[PDB]
Design a binder for this molecule. Structure first.
Ligand code: RET
Ligand code: RET
Ligand code: RET
Lengths: 223, 223, 223
């Protein structure tokens, strides 16, 4: 209880836990091979996120990266959580639109480079290079959202306004969800430094819960 | 030859090596696409295990984790071996019972969290938190064995006592094999500390050889 | 600009970048599910390689491994690049010859052990053990080239001299490409030490560009 952001990591850990159990209880009784997959993926996302947030809460997923003449603490576990949960989420969207394996491998591969370079930008001691990796990381994000924005609209083509409105909203939500992360990274203590550490943890905690748990609800509430 | 457990790591490395060659020689001459898979998986398990045990034998896979006011050495390579070989083993069992991709992804994902959290519990400097990760790690193990225990019995249903007895034994063996690991971790120098380090290495060495090599024999001795 | 090999890492980074864009621009307009895969794999190889070479260029992928009584710098990012790009390349060759999943899993699994043990040999402080891991790493390479040499010739069997000559050349090129790496490692500052560091970076830079970018051209120039 020495860090001023322990409350957020606690709420995050708890929310990730409750979300996991909900998906676990509701996931029992499914024998359809295709429905079981959507329940296995959406349930592992918060399961991984819960364990990652417990490490930060216990201070295990925190390190000191001396950049800018200061010992700015960097929660490396956050990127680990995104590394294992962002591809799983892309799989729920891929199977939804029924994209070919080529489209999937490109999205996953681009996601790894996005998170990969993103972590380097956070572990760099030179302040100028930190944003270099940020530019490449973000560039990989645009590609993911580009294919998603294109792959989603093509699924709701033809003529079905009632059903077409469903895929159009899920598309927009995804674009704004992924886009919020690089913005919080730029203004937080890991980029520019306008937002202090405690408020930074709050922003990412809201985005993770909204994605790992929140988005998992809207996705599995579809037939 | 300064550590009192170098003999066990030596025997382990040797046994993993002999097991690999046996599977490699016996694996030649297989053209059946489905039979080649069972030979590729069962052969990589000891191949990985052999390299992991050579690192501990040479002192490369050993670190000092100061917990409990002592510099207890922790063989991190052990978890690395389990991390890459436990999912492969689950694949031999999955293809055997012919489980759907949903069941497989849930088992693999739960296995990563099991080994993942398990390693954190071994790299924690706070004695109280070490067992917290142990509880979560074990909880992930129960899920794997739950689905296995359920998925295996369903394969030997209908009426075939002669063939049904085969799947019932492999099931029991797997339950007792995976269950032994968390017990050795709890009593060893990484948990409570009732068993010294040298005896701990012996227990895990017997379990690994029995699994990576021993279990690989019984599995490939089936038509 | 303090290291005498910054020029090579710069050229490498630039070449990896140009190669990526070329594959990215030329990869647009492909709707064939099978053709998109070959474009997704061949494009991620240089994309990963570009990011890995930018880390070494910026000094992020470099560490000091005290072996032989000297602080020999070891570019660990090189192995990371090979770790994520060598399996992707094997996939382009697998889908080309249309190998069964068993053959693929064995090649990929053997490739991980090859790069895995290879990195240990480069991070070992004992000069004698460095070559031990080199022997195992190379041994895993021979297996990959053995299956490749066997799997490639079988694709050009029957009677088609015009088309058969195509697969026979790609085979030979691959054998000589993979074989060059362990040779440069043995003579460089990471093994024997006959070749200085700056010349070592040049050799690997030529081999990586030839593989990640160069070989990617010849592979995608086939119908
Ligand atoms: C937790 C769930 C999701 C979908 C998280 C997504 C996060 C990102 C796309 C973050 C990307 C980053 C960028 C673009 C640049 C700085 C490093 C980040 C990882 C924050
Ligand atoms: C080597 C082959 C197998 C099947 C090994 C399995 C090992 C485990 C399931 C170990 C699990 C652990 C638990 C439950 C808690 C402490 C950390 C361990 C990894 C030892
Ligand atoms: C970058 C593209 C390719 C195909 C690179 C391949 C590299 C190897 C097969 C290197 C193998 C090694 C060996 C055999 C021994 C020392 C460690 C190395 C990784 C250099």
């Amino acid at each position: 209880t020495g860090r001023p952001e322990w409350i957020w990591l606690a709420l995050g850990t708890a929310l990730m836990g409750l979300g996991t159990l909900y998906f676990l209880v509701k996931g029992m009784g499914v024998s359809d091979p295709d429905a079981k997959k959507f329940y296995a993926i959406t349930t592992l996302v918060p399961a991984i996120a819960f364990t990652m947030y417990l490490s930060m809460l216990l201070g295990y997923g925190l390190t000191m990266v001396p950049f800018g003449g200061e010992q700015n603490p960097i929660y490396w576990a956050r990127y680990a959580d995104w590394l294992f949960t962002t591809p799983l989420l892309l799989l729920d969207l891929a199977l939804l639109v029924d994209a070919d394996q080529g489209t999937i491998l490109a999205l996953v591969g681009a996601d790894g480079i996005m998170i990969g370079t993103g972590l380097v930008g956070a572990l760099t001691k030179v302040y100028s290079y930190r944003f270099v990796w940020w530019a490449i990381s973000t560039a990989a994000m645009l590609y993911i959202l580009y294919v998603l924005f294109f792959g989603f609209t093509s699924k709701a083509e033809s003529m079905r306004p009632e059903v077409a409105s469903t895929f159009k909203v899920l598309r927009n939500v995804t674009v704004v969800l992924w886009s919020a992360y690089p913005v919080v990274w730029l203004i937080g203590s890991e980029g520019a430094g306008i937002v202090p550490l405690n408020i930074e943890t709050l922003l990412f905690m809201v985005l993770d819960v909204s994605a790992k748990v929140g988005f998992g609800l809207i996705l599995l509430r579809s037939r």
